């Protein structure tokens, strides 16, 4: 019994009068000195060792890519050298299975650098790092490079859709004579700096050839650039984004789910809220920020039903629906609910 109703705030509260390992779908968190499990939004966080200096792996090949499964944060680097992707016949090492590269779709952060020098020819993007959001750069490759992509002759677009911060390090993107979409990137927003000789981009595909073929940024992207074609591959959106995809608008007045804006991002609103036609439906995602309740109202919150037996600090709480669907308290000297405020309206 962890939750207890409150007469003052009209909602549930943590009950003050309420080892084992957490399940694989829950992470062990600490709420002010109280160990408890908490569900993970999809995959649970898991730290994994990296590649390069400091680790026993020089490149990511066939013998180590299976250890990168369910990894959400590399505590190191990721090196994709030529001998790790195309094998090495002088040692009878087979080439890396390209479909094994999809294990990095769970990677959301890299502590050190990202060194990509070889990629399967049938993969025109690094979309296997679509969930990569932050490159730390605590350890750097070569001359202070935190991101290095050289001589990948079959990469059309980068594909780092969610990458929005590179804390430190220089950037090298060269010798990719078929790469586009990267010319209009606003690296000042990603690098958190002034890009003072921190960009080494050259000898790719010329801007004149990418623009003439219509392979530029989507009109829904803003001036911040785009990691490829489509409304999803934008860095920032011109107006609003729904689920990481740039859209023309949210659903303030019409739509399958009524939405509200928060920092130019569309979030669906609380289900206990009446969808309003032509007018706004909600301020935020809470049940107390809505325009009109979908059913009933218990104080500030819109509820589906009035508290009919919920435990409180003094006992069971019983409330009756008012004439206008407001959850008002039943009479004190009454048990098992009531119909109205009067005494005989009980039981």
């Amino acid at each position: 019994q962890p939750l207890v109703y409150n007469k003052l705030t009209f909602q549930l509260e943590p009950n003050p009068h309420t080892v084992r390992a957490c399940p694989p779908d829950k992470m062990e968190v600490d709420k002010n000195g109280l160990k408890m499990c908490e569900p993970c939004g999809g995959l649970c966080p898991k730290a994994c060792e990296g590649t390069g200096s400091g680790s026993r792996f020089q490149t990511v090949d066939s013998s180590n890519i299976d250890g990168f499964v369910n990894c959400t944060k590399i505590l190191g680097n990721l090196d994709f050298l030529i001998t790790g992707l195309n094998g090495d016949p002088w040692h009878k090492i087979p080439a890396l299975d390209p479909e094994k590269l999809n294990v990095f779709r769970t990677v959301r952060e890299i502590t050190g650098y990202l060194n990509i020098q070889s990629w399967p020819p049938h993969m025109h993007n690094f979309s296997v790092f679509s969930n990569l959001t932050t490159i730390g750069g605590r350890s750097l490759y070569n001359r202070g490079f935190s991101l290095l992509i050289m001589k990948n002759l079959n990469v059309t677009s980068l594909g780092f859709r969610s990458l929005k911060e590179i804390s430190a390090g220089r950037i090298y993107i060269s010798a990719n004579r078929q790469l586009c979409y990267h010319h209009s990137l606003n690296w000042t927003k990603v690098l958190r700096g002034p890009t003072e000789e921190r960009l080494d981009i050259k000898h790719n595909r010329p801007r004149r050839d990418c623009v003439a073929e219509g392979k530029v940024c989507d009109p829904l992207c803003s001036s911040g650039g785009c990691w490829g074609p489509g409304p999803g591959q934008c860095l920032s959106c011109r107006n609003y984004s729904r689920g990481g995809v740039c859209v023309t608008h949210c659903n303030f007045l019409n739509g399958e789910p009524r939405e509200f804006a928060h920092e130019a991002e569309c979030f669906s609103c609380h289900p206990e809220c009446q969808p309003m036609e032509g007018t706004a439906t909600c301020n935020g995602s809470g049940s107390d920020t809505c325009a009109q309740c979908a059913h009933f109202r218990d104080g500030p919150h819109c509820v589906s039903s009035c508290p009919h037996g919920v435990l409180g600090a003094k006992g069971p709480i019983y409330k009756y629906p008012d004439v206008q669907n407001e959850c008002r308290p039943c009479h004190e000297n009454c048990t098992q609910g009531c119909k109205g405020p009067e005494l005989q309206d009980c039981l």
Partner: antibody
Amino acid sequence: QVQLVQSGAEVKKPGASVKVSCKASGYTFTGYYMHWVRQAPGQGLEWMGWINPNSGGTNYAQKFQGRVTMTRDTSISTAYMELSRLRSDDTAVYYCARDHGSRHFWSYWGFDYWGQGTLVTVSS
Amino acid sequence: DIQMTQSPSSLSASVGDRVTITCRASQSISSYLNWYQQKPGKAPKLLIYAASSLQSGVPSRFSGSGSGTDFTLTISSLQPEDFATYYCQQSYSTPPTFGQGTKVEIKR
């Protein structure tokens, strides 16, 4: 063994031009970049620029950019530096050094072999 | 331009002493720093490259260390052939910058 031979000493007047050679022998001439470093009498070192002896590409320092022309002659394995628009403060000993790396992007720009040094005195 | 700052400028030490010269970078240069020895009137000789790696031929008493900003060229037991001027070179940025140079002198 590896050995870099430069031209003799030169004496120039302010405004003329000097072209110092660097004859290489003992290694694949087109396999390692050629750096040029000068040293004023009783002073430190000063890097002027390198030249790719395979492609002919150059990379001059900003101070000298516009009045230094580094060329190559792979038929005789010789590198040349022509520093025109001479001044009094250009009086130094011009060395030619060779990058210790065949793959330049991963090189550390360490000068493992130098020339004997060419003194160029520029005064009115 | 990443200016190198060597310390000390001059140094008086005798044969057998352990000397230590320091090369400080104005900004972080990772591990791209070399060391050189210049005899009077001779061209510089490469001692240590890549901060710590010892060039082939140089004796094992020459050793380098450090990364980022502070680097150090340490040689143990000075030898008569080791009395010269020592420069540090950075190769991180496009114009290689040298230090002012330390000049070890014979104590007397």
